[PDB]
Design a protein around this ligand. Structure first.
Ligand code: SF4
Length: 225
């Protein structure tokens, strides 16, 4: 399946089935996308929604989050687990207030410079909130790509990771990137699951290698032992 076909089929799918009404999808801003991405990294969406709403109410802007005492941030985070995310979240908020005048950065370099923000997250923030042309690659997106293009190596390996980043770059369009990237995350989270993927409900089923050979269990490769 060519790249043009890949994005086109994903976009058509998103239009008809994709969720576009979550709290962090309404009146999107870099701040809301960032906050949600960090909460979603290690936590299920259902659990995240109430916390996101509580955070946005208490911290309407990044400067409000920055000026707040860390103890208050951790108290509100209670129940989400993986508190390192919270600690970095607060530091990043303070970095935005200090270095960027309270305006969450809208350029890749500045975003990726924040604590707790990686290449994929920075790309997600700018693409989802401003439509900037950046590809993403988290565990969910990587699984979809690895299966579709049969990448059997372990993503923990440098060459494999770079290979997956190349594939994401190839299929990610500029036109409609905000929709494409959200769709990819949705597919990997709801359709292309680790176990028994719902291939019949997948928009890439007609070109996916793993589906053609019923070999989804081989991709991505597991850490050798
Ligand atoms: S067809 Fe199946 S294995 Fe392939 S990307 Fe879709 S859900 Fe994953």
């Amino acid at each position: 399946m060519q790249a043009s076909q890949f994005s086109a089929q994903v976009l058509d799918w998103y239009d008809k089935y994709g969720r576009k009404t979550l709290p962090w999808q309404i009146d999107k801003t870099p701040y809301k996308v960032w906050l949600s991405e960090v909460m979603l990294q290690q936590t299920q969406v259902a659990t995240v929604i109430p916390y996101f709403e509580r955070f946005m109410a208490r911290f309407p802007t990044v400067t409000d989050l920055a000026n707040a005492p860390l103890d208050e941030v951790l108290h509100l985070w209670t129940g989400l687990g993986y508190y390192a995310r919270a600690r970095n979240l607060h530091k990043a908020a303070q970095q935005v207030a200090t270095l960027h005048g309270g305006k969450f950065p809208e350029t890749f370099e500045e975003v990726a410079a924040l604590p707790g923000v990686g290449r994929s997250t920075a790309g997600a923030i700018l693409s989802l909130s401003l439509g900037k042309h950046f590809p993403i690659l988290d565990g969910n997106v990587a699984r979809v790509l690895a299966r579709c293009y049969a990448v059997s190596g372990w993503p923990g390996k440098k060459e494999v990771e770079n290979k997956l980043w190349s594939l994401s770059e190839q299929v990610t369009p500029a036109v409609g990137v905000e929709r494409f990237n959200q769709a990819m995350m949705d597919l990997g989270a709801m359709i292309c699951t680790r176990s028994k993927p719902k291939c019949s409900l997948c928009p890439l089923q007609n070109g996916c290698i793993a589906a053609a050979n019923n070999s989804w269990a081989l991709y991505p490769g597991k850490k050798p032992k």
